[PDB]
Design a binder for this molecule. Structure first.
Ligand SMILES: O=c1ccn([C@H]2C[C@H](O)[C@@H](COP(=O)(O)O)O2)c(=O)[nH]1
Lengths: 132, 140
C-alpha cells in the first residue's frame, strides 16, 4: 500500500546486520557515538568531492547533464543514510523529530517570525517517544 | 493516500518560501552548489560538536539520559533538512534515490565488519545504480 519511510528503512538495515536499534530513545555507549561520527565524516567527504568535481567541470565550460548528477545524488543519499542511521541507533524516531523541525521551519516561513512562533522542541518529542 | 515523506516536506518548504524547485533532475548553477555545500558543512559541524560534547561527558564519567540526546537529535534532523534540501534543489526525488541505495545496503548483510563496527561489503557485492534512478526520473 505505502512504501516504508527512509527512517524505517534504516531500522530494517540495522536489524539485517545485527546493529543496535532500540525501540525507544536510549543513551548510547561511546563506541556507538564514535562510529556515527566516522560514518558522517566519510559521507560528508564524498559529497564534497563530488560537488568539487561538478564545479571544476562547469568552470571548464562543460554543459552538465541530468546523468552527471548521479554521483552527487548517490553521495547525498549516503549522507541521509548515515544521518538517519545515527537517529535509529539512538532509538529516536527520525520522522517524529524531522516533523517537529519541519513544523518550526514551515511555521517560520508563514510570517521574520510569526506572532506565536514556537521553535523546534525536540526534548518534547523525545519525552513523547518514551511513552508511545 | 500515503503520508508525505520528509523529501516531500522539503519540496513544500521550498514552495512556501517562494523558491519552488524543479520537478525533474536539473543541473544547477555553480552558485547553487557552493551555497548547498556551505549549508552542509555548517550543519555537519553542529552535529560533530554535539557528538563531541556527549563523548566528553561520558569520558568524564557522567551518565547520559535520553533527554540529554535532544540537542544531538535536533542537529541530526537539521542535517537531514539541508541534505534533503540539496536533492530537492537539484530536482532529484530523494526517496527514489534512497530506495536504491537502501537495496544495495541490505545486500551487505553477509559482509564482515570493521573494528569500529562499520558494515563492510561481502565478496560479489554490487553497488546501487543511481544513474538508472536519475535516468528513470528524467524521462518519466
Ligand atoms: O556500518 C555501516 C556501513 C555502511 N552504511 C551505508 C551508508 C552508505 O549508504 C553506505 C556507505 O558504505 P561504504 O561505501 O562507505 O562502504 O553504506 C551504514 O549505514 N552503516
Amino acid at each position: 500500500p505505502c512504501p516504508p519511510t527512509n527512517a524505517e528503512r534504516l531500522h530494517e538495515f540495522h536489524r539485517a546486520i545485527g546493529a543496535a536499534t532500540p525501540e525507544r530513545p536510549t543513551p548510547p555507549p561511546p563506541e556507538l557515538l564514535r562510529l556515527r561520527q566516522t560514518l558522517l565524516d566519510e559521507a560528508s567527504a564524498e559529497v564534497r568531492a563530488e560537488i568539487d568535481h561538478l564545479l571544476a567541470r562547469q568552470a571548464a565550460g562543460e554543459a552538465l547533464s541530468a546523468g552527471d548528477l548521479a554521483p552527487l545524488a548517490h553521495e547525498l543519499a549516503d549522507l541521509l543514510y548515515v544521518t538517519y542511521g545515527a537517529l535509529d541507533q539512538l532509538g529516536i524516531d527520525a520522522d517524529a523529530v524531522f516533523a517537529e523541525v519541519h513544523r518550526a521551519n514551515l511555521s517560520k516561513a508563514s510570517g521574520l517570525k510569526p506572532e506565536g512562533w514556537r521553535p523546534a522542541d525536540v526534548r518534547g518529542v523525545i519525552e513523547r517517544l518514551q511513552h508511545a
